[PDB]
Amino acid sequence: SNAMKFLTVSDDMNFLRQVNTLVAGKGDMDSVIIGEGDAKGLGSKVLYRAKKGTPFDAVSEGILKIAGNYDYIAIGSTEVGREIAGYLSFKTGFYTATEIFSLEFNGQKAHTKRFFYGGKTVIEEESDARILTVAPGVIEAKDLGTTPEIRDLEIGQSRIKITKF
Amino acid sequence: AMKFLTVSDDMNFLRQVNTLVAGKGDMDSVIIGEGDAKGLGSKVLYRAKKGTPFDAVSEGILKIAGNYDYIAIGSTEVGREIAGYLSFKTGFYTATEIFSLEFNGQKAHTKRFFYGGKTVIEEESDARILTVAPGVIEAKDLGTTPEIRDLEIGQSRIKITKF
């Protein structure tokens, strides 16, 4: 009720675990995984699953369908995750706090930190960011000790053209 | 003609971005920090002092943004943060990490690499904000040197801590 609702997202299961660890103490969470990974100990209430190599635009349109169910969406910063963030940012109108290693709430607002220049500098924001991307390697994953109900992400249409080499 | 503003915190990267953009319309540029303007090929170069916080630069750019159809930014850490700020303030879509840019009519037709080169992603979008991937464009000298002016920067809200 008065608790915050997160949706966490990644195209990498280990990374999904790190994002869930960051968000864990902060409110209730559901998750999206693109591709493979065993859901055990993930800690989410619900895990939405997309097929491996589902084009990132079809995934983003799927997330967008459920994104109004959440206060914040936290995405692992990978190539795909960043494309998903930019897409969601645009469609929802919410600002994105990028590459964070730290997320705290004093009251209502999200206070974040990210590194700049390889770690030489720390940038803190208190912004209205509702979309967050989480840096790789910054959170050690903890087993959260429960397993989510699994469902399929209802995937959108894809307009991108994909050429492999 | 279409109007472009090109942006970077690195001058060699700004030359790359200009080289991608050059044939497509008019061009002005924003550099954050140091570098020789020679051969940059924009009409005007707005300078901000090395180390100006990215939100201050972004607010400076917002002041002049309505003068442009497109803003193309070198994808560095600062360039990406700027692109995000501008996306959020303007409401425009961003096409990211591009190596190629063409127009059908007004829609941007872009290409980008995925996985350091294994895959090319080709899109048509309404993106008015673009980031260019590092090292994919061979910077050319473009034959002219812009007049120099200072970027009127805005306020900064971010807190910066050095190690």
From TrEMBL, chain B:
GO biological process: fatty acid beta-oxidation using acyl-CoA dehydrogenase
Keyword tags: Flavoprotein, Transport
The Electron transfer flavoprotein alpha/beta-subunit N-terminal domain, residue ranges: 56-150
Source superkingdom: Archaea
UniProt entry tagged with the keyword Transport: yes
GO MF entry, a single one: flavin adenine dinucleotide binding
Homology family: Belongs to the ETF alpha-subunit/FixB family.
Descriptive protein name: Electron transfer flavoprotein subunit alpha related protein
Source organism of this protein record: Thermoplasma acidophilum (strain ATCC 25905 / DSM 1728 / JCM 9062 / NBRC 15155 / AMRC-C165)
